[PDB]
């Protein structure tokens, strides 16, 4: 269940979320050692809107549509560790949680 | 700083001291525990801030207080117990400050 993702220092990495087409997302909350960001639905082609909630992450968090895949860019060694998405949707279970372990490599 | 301990009674309310002593500089506060908890942002214009709860465990049970941004978790549960963290994002340096709490819950 804890999915391992590897990223390269100074580059970008994608966290697989892949929200399917019957599910409707209300808000996804991302956390690590600090809160990271909240992601909310975009539009026709506005991609999901991302609100960053710790200064360590400002300008480094992007979200992809329609999957709601998270991209963190300009990776730092300090980004490594456990991440959690609490995915909130209109219908039940209402909240589903996904776990990730990011490891960072200077290459 | 230090972890701050707050005690609460099952079924009741507990208040987390935030004591923002310069409110209108607050952009967003992100509360987490074992799970996500809520975001709190400025009211359009008000005393009072707006809560968006971000996990169903805490649905309808999070309130914030103007003007200090103190947090209330109402209808308390035993699962509510443990370490809480607020990432307070404001308009000027350090831009993010973090407060740590320990919520002890007791029987009704």
Q: Which two tokens stand for residue B33?
A: 């525990």
Identify the three-state secondary structure at position A78: helix
B41 and B49 Cβ atoms separated by less than 8 Å: yes
Name the residue among A34, A94, A95 with its Cβ closest to that of B87. Answer: A34
Beta carbons of A30 and A37 less than 8 angstroms apart: yes
Q: Which of B19, B20, B61, B12 is nearest to B38 (CA)?
A: B61
Task: Report the C-alpha gap between A19 and A23 in whole angstroms.
Answer: 7
| A86 chain-B contacts, CB cut-off 8 A | 35-36, 54-55
Do the Cβ atoms of A86 and B55 come within 8 Å? yes
Neighbouring CB atoms inside 10 A of A66's CB total: 14
Task: Determine the 3-state secondary structure of B103 from DSSP.
Answer: strand
> Distance of CA A6 to CAs A37, A74, A85, Å?
20, 14, 17
Write out the residues of chain A at the interface with chain B, using a CB-CB cutoff of 8 A: 27, 29, 31, 34-35, 38, 51, 53-56, 58, 84, 86, 88, 93-95, 97
Nearest CB to A38 within list B54, B94, B96: B54
H or E element in which residue A63 lies: strand A61-63
Q: Which CATH superfamily hosts domain A1-107?
A: Immunoglobulins (2.60.40.10)
A-chain CB neighbours of B87 within 8 Å are 34-35, 53-54
Residues A25 and A81: their CA atoms lie apart, in Å, by 25
Tokens of A43: 């539009």
Q: What is the DSSP string of A15-34?
A: EP----TT--EEEEEEESSS
From which experimental method does this structure derive? Answer: X-ray
In Å, how far is A95's CA from the nearest CA of chain B?
A: 6
Dihedral angle, C-alpha A30, B2, A80, A4, nearest 10 ° = -60
Domain borders along chain B are 1-108
Instruction: Tell me the CATH class for B1-108.
Output: mainly beta
Phi, psi of A30 (to 5 degrees): -105, 135
* Contact between chains at A88 and B39 (C-beta distance less than 8 A): no
**In a 3-state reduction of DSSP, which class is residue B32?**
strand
Residue B93 near residue A55, CB atoms below 8 Å: no
Q: What is the dihedral of CA B31, B88, A29, A85, to 10 degrees?
A: -80
Rounded distance between C-alpha atoms, residue B64 and residue A62, angstroms: 29
Q: Does B89 contact A54 at a Cβ distance shorter than 8 Å?
A: yes
Using DSSP, state whether A77 is helix, strand or coil.
helix
Nearest residue of A to residue B41, measured between CA atoms: A53
Please report the beta strands in chain B, taking only residues with DSSP state E, as ranges in sequence order. 3-9, 14-16, 26-32, 36-41, 50-53, 62-64, 71-73, 82-90, 96-106
Best A26, A31, A85 member to test B by mutation, with max B CBs in 10 Å, is: A31
CA distance B70 to B20: 8
Q: What is the resolution of this structure in A?
A: 2.0
């Amino acid at each position: 269940e804890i999915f391992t993702v590897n990223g390269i220092l100074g580059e970008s990495v994608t966290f697989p979320v892949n929200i399917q087409e019957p599910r409707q997302v209300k808000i996804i909350a991302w956390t690590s050692k600090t809160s990271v960001a909240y992601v909310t639905p975009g539009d026709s082609e506005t991609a999901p809107v991302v609100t960053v909630t710790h200064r360590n992450y400002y300008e480094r968090i992007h979200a992809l549509g329609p999957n709601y895949n998270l991209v963190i860019s300009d990776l730092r060694m300090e980004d490594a560790g456990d991440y959690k998405a609490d995915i909130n949707t209109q219908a039940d279970p209402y909240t589903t949680t996904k776990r990730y372990n990011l490891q960072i490599y200077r290459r």
